[PDB]
Amino acid sequence: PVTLEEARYKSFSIKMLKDMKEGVKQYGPNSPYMRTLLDSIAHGHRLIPYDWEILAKSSLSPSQFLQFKTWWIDGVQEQVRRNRAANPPVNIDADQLLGIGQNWSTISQQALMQNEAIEQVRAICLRAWEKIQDPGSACPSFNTVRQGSKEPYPDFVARLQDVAQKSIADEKARKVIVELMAYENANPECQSAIKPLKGKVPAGSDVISEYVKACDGIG
Amino acid sequence: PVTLVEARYKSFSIKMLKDMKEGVKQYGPNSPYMRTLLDSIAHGHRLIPYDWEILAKSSLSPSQFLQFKTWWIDGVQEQVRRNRAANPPVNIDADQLLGIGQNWSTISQQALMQNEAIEQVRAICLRAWEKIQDPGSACPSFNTVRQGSKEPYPDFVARLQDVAQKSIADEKARKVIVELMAYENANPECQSAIKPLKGKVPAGSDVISEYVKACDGIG
Amino acid sequence: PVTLEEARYKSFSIKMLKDMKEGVKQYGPNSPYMRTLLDSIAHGHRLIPYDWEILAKSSLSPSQFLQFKTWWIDGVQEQVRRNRAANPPVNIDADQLLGIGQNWSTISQQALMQNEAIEQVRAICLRAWEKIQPSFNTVRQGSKEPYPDFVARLQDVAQKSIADEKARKVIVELMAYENANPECQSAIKPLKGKVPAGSDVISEYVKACDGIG
Amino acid sequence: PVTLEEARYKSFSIKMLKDMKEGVKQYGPNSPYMRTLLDSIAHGHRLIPYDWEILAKSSLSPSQFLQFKTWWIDGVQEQVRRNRAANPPVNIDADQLLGIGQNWSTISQQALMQNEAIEQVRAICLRAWEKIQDPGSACPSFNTVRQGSKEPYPDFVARLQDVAQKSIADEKARKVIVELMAYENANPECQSAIKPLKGKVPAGSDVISEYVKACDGIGG
Amino acid sequence: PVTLEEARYKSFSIKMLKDMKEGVKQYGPNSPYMRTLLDSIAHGHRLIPYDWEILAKSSLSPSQFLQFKTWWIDGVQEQVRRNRAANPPVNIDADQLLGIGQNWSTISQQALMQNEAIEQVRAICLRAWEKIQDPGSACPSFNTVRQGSKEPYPDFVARLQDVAQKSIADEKARKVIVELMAYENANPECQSAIKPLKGKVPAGSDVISEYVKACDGIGG
């Protein structure tokens, strides 16, 4: 990170990388413990585009690093598209968010980065990180995920919320699809207990909270 | 190792060799955690060849050690060949880059070297470390590695970037070979999905990070 | 145990001493790891033989310590011969190299021992450590075995049961040429006999037998 | 071609069309004889895009003309992109190349081009001629070109170098892939007789020469 | 060629490359007609290694050009020895023959060479051209070529002389090998017709003239 006294760079401690690689190998890079460690490290310091590549190469398996770099590129493409239609078009070009080129390829140039580019790249890398699968499987579709019988109900909502966290871009459009896909793919006998479905939902109480409160008895 | 008007010697800690041995035993000497620890050691110190000898003794298996030593010899052969064709050819002989012979056999001899010999031997040892094979098996050719059905495409490109790092010496030759071997040797299906591509590569992008996006939902 | 412009003695720190015992019990005292770690311990500091006694006694089983002490005695007895015949004869006597006697049995006496004795005793003890403890011909490079793993196994057994370096450095390359896989055995025959500069023979056999997987 | 120094366009004689047509028919349009004829035609004269269209319609199969025109289009497509990214920018655009447009449709319009677009279209059209497919079949990929049994080395390396000439643009990328692939797809006998010489430049020569010098006598 | 009028240099015509390529295509690379035409060029002018490179690459198959370059490379490693093996050694190095290096890699450097160098490159270029193969076979050794049953004996001795023209450097041994192999590998019919005629010179006739004279009428 940097420290601004003006603006010198020091590398990571070794102890942070050690338990970072420990946690990534043990729990998988989307279990929420690592997810809340990562933004804690991100907000507790002041990161640069050179540092994220160091941490990602040091932590993930070699197969996953290409996926992380791919969704980094796909994020910065949409970011540099949306950053030109503003008023004024704010001067943050593409290459400064990747740390390459004739002016941002090394450390001593990148230590002078202003706050707005940091606030870009933090959100872009954090959006990027959760598009990384467990190293055995590929992300399926909503038509495939459907709970059977003899199985507890909230595990189904957990799996469906994980898939909808992966494959949906906007968080409001994420928030809409989940509860109706949870209703539409449940068990038969549980679904009857949810048959009110509307008008038992006042404004303010979160709707996905009430559904499990219906189906807690069936085990 | 060596600090600096006069130069005095120091050794390694016992803990750094301890977790070095632990890491090489657990993860494999080309898994990128060790590969980003080792250059973090190297670029932040001053490594005389005796300390490279200590790091080679104390960490690898018995079978890996002569595998390291042979490619050390075969690298320093070509380096002392290319040193003689310069203008003027720099007077850094063979045995200053191996630590043997009556001129460079003790620590007090080696402590008084120049920066050029250090910055040559660093690149030589780091080049030598990469072609250490895994203690399971030996490296195959290029025509052996082909993904089959029911296999994620980033795993295939991970294995292909792994095999081409050992054989081919230069870097630009690697970054020419890997995408031709990627586009050829793939599964048939998303072969089609990259068939309209090679259309363009925009500014702020490589080429290999497009195929992995285009073959994302196929497994 | 450094001078600092005066002689200053300091003990071993307790973590450095502690890790050595797990290092010995995990692999063994002639494993490559502990041997090179010991060599990197030695050349970085000044090792008064009292500290060598501490580091020896604090890291082995009692039988291995007995073997180390007796081969230390043998080595200093052999070296005090060749410390005489050179001209001028150096005054390096046996009590200076064992920490015993009326003028070498305290820390302040050994704290001013000069460099030539240190460079002698280091080559004594690292020679001593190697010897801490009968069929040969049953080594065969099998089917689909990589060649550099074969030369390591034959490097192992020839160390154990020939017990002389001037002999066993000649038996190996004779045995390395004979006992290989046949399909790469003919790939060595051009390099047979001829030698390049800057290397020995078994460094050059591995050059010509890489992609034979 | 056009000459400036009585400066007008002259249409070349019918015997040039004659031996051009025989040369493209009997040998193939990427045999080295047609290669060394075409550049000796091109450099000693001054060609307009109408002349290239005349010669290409006059001395090819219809399928060859069809394959020629489209890689000509693609060459103009790349040259237009690499035009404007120079400082100061140059006034070379698309319809100045293809011989169409309201300002470049007739012969008297395009006949008055100076010495830059002529060089650019001479750079493009020759590469497009080089990309023209053999009348036999389509250009295959690098893994079905493999020296089987009973086949000699010094035409298998040429069949390799042909496909490495078509599908890769810059020649510094062409060298290393053919130097690598000349070994990996080889028959086992030349493999065994070529692995002692792997990765050594002996004296003042390329690698392919001593490669083919090694396993000469393999035809049994 | 060079005309020597600071000198002058030119490329070839158009017609000469045309019938050169036609002759090497439709008959072979070392058929006698192409052989004497190449001797007529190689003595009637003064050639430069760049011109040899042009006349090679313009008029061979893409296969055979690598073989030409290969024996051109291995023909200079003897001249490097035998230019310093005699006393006094002449000043001819490796890079002057192949036209490469920093001192001989253009026309204006190579335009002013000396006559013994041109003679050495003429000898080594002709000896290079002789060792070129056909289209798609490999030249065998002597122990596999034999006369077939119901085969005309001059064809068999022509194939023997063609094989012995390649694999043996000196031409004096080419006399004494092929006639001794003629009686050896022949058919039993020509053997029975030839056995009284072992080694007899009547008057001024070489031995290969009489064997075909004796085994002429074989029509069974």
Author numbering:
A (entry chain B): 1 to 5, 22 to 235
B (entry chain A): 1 to 4, 21 to 235
C (entry chain C): 1 to 5, 22 to 149, 156 to 235
D (entry chain G), E (entry chain H): 1 to 5, 22 to 236
How do the authors describe this structure?
The D6 particles are also capsular with fully six-fold symmetric hexamers at the poles each surrounded by a ring of six pentamers and with six equatorial hexamers with similar distortions to those observed in the D5 structure. However, a comparison of the pentamer with the D6 polar hexamer, which obeys strict six-fold symmetry, shows that although helix α1–α2–α3 packing is maintained, in hexamers, the CArec monomers are positioned at a greater radius and are rotated away from the symmetry axis, relative to pentamers. As a result, the relative tilt angle between adjacent α1 helices is reduced and helix α2 comes closer to α3 of the neighbouring monomer allowing the additional monomer to be accommodated into the hexameric ring. This results in an alternative hydrogen-bonding configuration that defines the hexamer conformation where R143 now makes an intra-monomer hydrogen bond with the side chain of Q181 on the penultimate turn of α7, D171 is hydrogen bonded with S79′ but with a shifted geometry and the K229-D90′ interaction is absent. Again, the pentamer conformation remains invariant and the hexamer six-fold symmetry is broken by NTD domain movements, changes in the NTD–CTD linker conformation and in the intra-hexamer CTD–NTD hydrogen bonding configuration and in the CTD radial position when interacting with either a neighbouring pentamer or hexamer.
CA forms the capsid shell surrounding the viral core that protects and transports the viral genome and also interacts with host cell factors that are necessary for trafficking, nuclear entry and proviral integration. Further, we assemble particles from HML2 CArec in vitro and use single-particle cryogenic electron microscopy (cryo-EM) to determine the high-resolution structures of four different types of Fullerene shell assemblies. Our studies of HML2 CArec show that an ERV retains the ability to form capsid assemblies using the same architecture as exogenous viruses. Analysis of the shell structures reveals the intra- and inter-molecular interactions that drives CA assembly into pentamers and hexamers and their association into shells that encapsidate the retroviral genome.
